[PDB]
Structures are given as structure tokens and as C-alpha cells.
């Protein structure tokens with residue numbers, strides 16, 4: 001029934017393929033968790049589905065429709081189950097509309113660096129939902145194996161404003177209320193959906209041209225940011241070219257950061273990174289941008305493989321440093337140092353406390369470093385292009401990476417990667433031959 005995640009075995013519904021969320025969210029008082037929702041899901045299926053089971057934690061569903069007609073539905077625990085008049089079969093799509101309202105619940109999971117879900121602090125409400133927090137404010141197939149496109153229609157008080165992932169199209173105002181529309185036109189995981197409401201100002205920058213591709217530029221500045229909370233002029237343009245030259249074209253139409261005056265980790269929300277000021281650094285801005293490839297475009301099949309996103313996003317830091325004339329080998333040496341005093345575990349996490357631990361970031365990065373040094377920069381750069389392509393539209397797993405390594409680069413490169421992926425060992429620091 002569920003996706004069957006090795007870490008979160010209850011989230012999601014197997015075979016469900018959500019393709020588009022058309023969400024109308026109304027936030028009455030930014031900074032307080034209550035809200036109302038009006039979402040229509042365009043869903044497909046990999047297998048016949050008698051029921052559409054979505055994740056939801058907090059708000060209560062009031063009405064449900066399927067293809068425009070009233071439909072039977074039940075909200076049970078952290079799930080909303082919708083009985084279809086006839087099974088949804090592969091190849092066909094339907095429209096599931098849900099009216100809901102209430103208070104999103106935060107998922108205070110024990111081993112996570114954050115409490116994912118609808119955040120509320122200092123007159124600001126925003127989503128920081130990795131891994132399984134999106135279900136708090138949106139009925140969803142809450143798993144990274146099922147990315148989807150988003151159209152969000154945010155209704156807020158006139159005094160406030162809002163920003164979501166995707167290009168901002170229209171804004172209307174009536175009876176002292178404001179409505180902003182954003183369209184995320186490239187599929188990304190539920191936790192990758194940016195959504196911020198409160199005192200914030202949009203700021204655009206000139207377009208960035210990456211060959212034939214055009215990437216729009218805009219940043220969000222919330223009120224009350226600390227002095228010096230900025231984006232260095234020209235930095236994001238240079239970062240885009242360096243990373244896109246390694247990975248392939250930037251997968252989205254816009255990029256920027258949403259600088260918040262709060263104290264929290266940064267989240268790679270699609271095309272608009274949720275960036276609390278206490279994390280606004282050059283290597284975190286590069287990190288978040290790298291995740292637009294590894295994490296938002298290339299999505300995980302199982303939360304045990306977070307190193308496919310964090311290790312890849314961490315290695316981009318080394319590539320960016322080298323692009324700026326720095327010694328990347330010395331950065332890899334720092335990674336090893338923070339590992340040589342920590343125990344080992346395979347890269348595939350077995351419990352929730354490990355999915356965002358030091359090994360998922362640095363041991364995964366050093367795994368890529370070991371592979372790169374074994375095949376050469378040219379072969380390694382070509383694999384990263386092939387890796388992204390191979391896993392666009394298809395969730396990535398550790399097994400699939402090793403297979404692609406074996407297929408593309410040979411068994412020796414594979415065994416080098418397998419030493420770091422499997423083994424419960426800390427291998428020696430990868431150094432140039």
C-alpha cells in the first residue's frame with residue numbers, strides 16, 4: 001500500500017504518480033499555523049489503484065471530489081483515503097480535489113536536524129519540510145520517489161506578501177486580501193516546494209544565459225534581516241555556469257534565495273532556496289544550488305540513499321572551490337579528518353538518525369572523490385552529465401548508481417565506489433596517484 005521506504009515505511013502510496021498539484025492556500029495570519037486549502041491533484045498510476053491515499057498531518061478534509069464529482073473519502077491517522085468509483089489504471093489520469101483547513105502538525109522526528117513541516121515564527125510562515133513535512137500543510141504523496149509539478153495560488157493579507165517555487169505570474173487583490181500565483185513547471189519532490197508568507201520583498205536580477213538556456217534571477221528578502229545579509233553580485237551567475245558545466249543544463253527556469261531572518265538550516269526548495277540568514281554563506285549557497293540537480297531533479301527512490309543528494313551536493317562545493325582557484329584536495333582532506341574520528345556505516349542509511357549525518361555528506365563526497373581520481377576529470381565530468389540524464393524522470397538508488405558506474409566507467413571504477421558505498425570501513429583518503 002505504502003511506498004515502502006526503508007526509513008519511513010508508512011509514507012506515500014505505491015504506484016501513485018502525482019503529476020500536478022493545483023493548490024489554493026489561504027494563510028489568514030502569517031506567523032500562526034492555521035490555514036485553509038483547496039488542492040486539485042492530477043494523478044496517474046503505475047498499477048491499478050482502487051483508492052488514492054494521500055499523506056496529511058494536522059488539517060482536516062471537509063470535502064473531496066474526483067473528476068469534478070463528489071467522492072467517498074475518509075481521513076484516518078496521517079492518511080486521507082479516497083475510494084474511486086472505478087480503479088485508476090496505468091495510462092489514465094484523474095482530478096482529485098480536496099478542501100481542507102486546520103493547523104499543520106510538525107513532524108518532530110528524533111534523529112532529524114530539523115522538525116520538518118509548516119514553520120511559524122516572527123510573523124513568517126514557510127515550508128521547511130524535508131524529509132516528510134509537506135504532509136503537514138498539503139495532502140500529498142509525501143515521498144521523493146514521486147516528484148510533481150506545482151501551481152500554488154497563495155491568499156494572504158494585503159499587508160503581507162508571499163513567494164513560492166516557480167515563476168511568479170499574477171497577483172490580485174480584493175476585500176483587503178491578496179492572491180499570488182506561482183507555477184513550478186519542472187517536477188520536484190514535495191519537500192522541494194517552496195512556500196513563504198509574511199513581510200518579504202521580491203528582488204530581480206538580470207537573466208543568466210547558460211548557452212541556449214535562459215535562467216531567470218530573483219531573490220526574496222524578508223523584513224528584519226541582519227545587516228550584511230546579501231547575495232554577492234555576480235556570484236550566482238558564476239555558480240550557475242560552473243555547476244551546469246559539470247552536471248548539464250540547469251533543470252529549472254529561475255533560481256534565487258529567499259533570505260529569512262530566522263535561525264535554521266538552508267533547504268534547497270526548487271528554484272528558490274529557503275535560506276535562513278544564519279546559513280547564508282558562499283558554500284551553502286553553492287550547496288543549495290547543487291541540490292537543484294541532485295535532489296530536486298534527480299530524486300531519491302528511498303530515504304536511505306540521502307547521500308545521493310547530500311554527498312553530491314557536498315562534492316559540488318569542492319568543484320566550486322577548484323573553479324575558484326582553491327585546492328580541492330585540501331578540502332577533501334578536511335572531509336576525511338571529520339570522518340577519521342567517527343565510526344563507519346555503509347552509505348545506505350539503516351535508521352533515520354543517519355540520513356542527514358556526517359557520513360551522508362562527507363563520506364558520500366569522498367566516495368565521489370575516490371571515483372573521480374580513479375577515472376580522470378574528463379571521464380568523471382562525463383559521468384556526472386550521464387548520471388543526471390540517467391536519473392531524470394526516474395528515482396535514483398545506490399544500487400542503480402553502482403550499476404551505472406559499472407556500465408559507463410568499468411568494473412574497477414565500480415569496485416572503487418563499492419569500497420566506499422559498502423563495507424562499514426573508512427577507506428584511505430583518496431589522493432592523486
Ligand SMILES: CC(C)C[C@H](N)C(=O)O
Nearest residue numbers: 113130265266267268356
Ligand atoms: C534541511 C536539511 C535537513 C537538508 C538540506 N537538504 C541540507 O542542506 O542538508
Ligand code: NA
Nearest residue numbers: 017018146147
Ligand atoms: Na509524479
Ligand SMILES: [Zn+2]
Nearest residue numbers: 287291310313
Ligand atoms: Zn544538502
